[PDB]
Design a protein around this ligand. Structure first.
Ligand SMILES: *[C@@H]1O[C@H](CO)[C@@H](O)[C@H](O)[C@H]1NC(C)=O
Ligand SMILES: *[C@@H]1O[C@H](CO)[C@@H](O)[C@H](O)[C@H]1NC(C)=O
Ligand SMILES: *[C@@H]1O[C@H](CO)[C@@H](O)[C@H](O)[C@H]1NC(C)=O
Ligand SMILES: [Ca+2]
Lengths: 147, 108
């Protein structure tokens, strides 16, 4: 009756017939809606000479998976779980203007899964991106670096 | 640093007399539940510990983990009194998987 057995039962039920290579939509015509947001942890560096910007960010992503659903009443009122993100399908968000870094998220932390199918995933990432630097008014300059 | 961590896992208990009076064993930390405690104010984006050492488990379910780590944390540098300056550099440790509702952090 302890929450641990209930969670183990839920895990065995969820990943019995789960394919992580498959877009998680009931209908082929359905579109996966990914809520995307950034959270800047710090501005590590602005490299004027190399025209590169290093940031530390949290990449907040949220979507729905129609296979990772359950009724909490049948699992001791478990409403949400944490699972490794490498066990489920994820969107392939990459930074186009990468420079001297990674295109994709490499940390792969755990994902928060709710009983209605909602998946919340917020891995950290350090990005080095390109941005043209204007030094007309240096050292009173205002730069505009994009991602 | 060594990030000393301690918690109880009730599922890792045993009766010593049934196992030749063994009082503790070493289990690979990769094979047991770990609290994902890391340094948030790191610079260079390194969060985890360096090696993921073994964990010492006691017969009563207590876990003692002592992994090494190389950390590059960022701190405000005060230059007012350089080169007679003293710096105040902090290191913030958090669980990136679990919030206060699931685990509590306590200073030994
Ligand atoms: C999928 O949606 C389309 C409409 O966009 C509908 O015509 C079709 O019958 C649906 N298929 C299933 C299996 O529900
Ligand atoms: C079940 O869990 C929810 C969310 O944690 C909580 O609000 C509720 O009090 C719990 N008990 C019942 C009977 O729903
Ligand atoms: C910054 O650059 C982007 C991309 O060129 C542009 O859309 C935006 O308007 C610019 N903002 C300012 C304040 O210059
Ligand atoms: Ca610089």
């Amino acid at each position: 009756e302890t929450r641990a057995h209930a969670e183990e039962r839920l895990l065995k039920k969820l990943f019995s017939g789960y394919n992580k290579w498959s877009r998680p939509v009931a209908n082929i015509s359905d579109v996966v809606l990914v809520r995307f947001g950034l959270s800047i942890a710090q501005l590590i560096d602005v490299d004027e000479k190399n025209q590169m910007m290093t940031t530390n960010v949290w990449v907040k992503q949220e979507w729905h998976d129609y296979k990772l659903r359950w009724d909490p009443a049948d699992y001791e009122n478990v409403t949400s779980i944490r699972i490794p993100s490498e066990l489920i399908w994820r969107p392939d968000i990459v930074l186009y203007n990468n420079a001297d870094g990674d295109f994709a998220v490499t940390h792969l932390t755990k994902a928060h899964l709710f009983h209605d199918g909602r998946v919340q995933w917020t891995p950290p990432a350090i990005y080095k991106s390109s941005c043209s630097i204007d030094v007309t008014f240096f050292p009173f300059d205002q730069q505009n670096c994009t991602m | 640093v060594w990030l000393t961590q301690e918690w109880e896992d009730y599922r890792l208990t045993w009766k010593p007399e049934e196992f030749d009076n063994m009082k503790k064993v070493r289990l690979p930390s990769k094979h047991i539940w770990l609290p994902d405690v890391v340094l948030y104010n790191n610079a260079d984006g390194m969060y985890e510990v360096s090696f993921y050492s073994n964990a010492v488990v006691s017969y009563d379910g207590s876990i003692f983990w002592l992994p090494p780590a190389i950390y590059k944390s960022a701190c405000k540098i005060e230059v007012k009194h350089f080169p007679f300056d003293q710096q105040n550099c902090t290191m913030k440790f958090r669980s990136w998987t679990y919030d206060r509702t699931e685990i509590d952090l306590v200073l030994k």
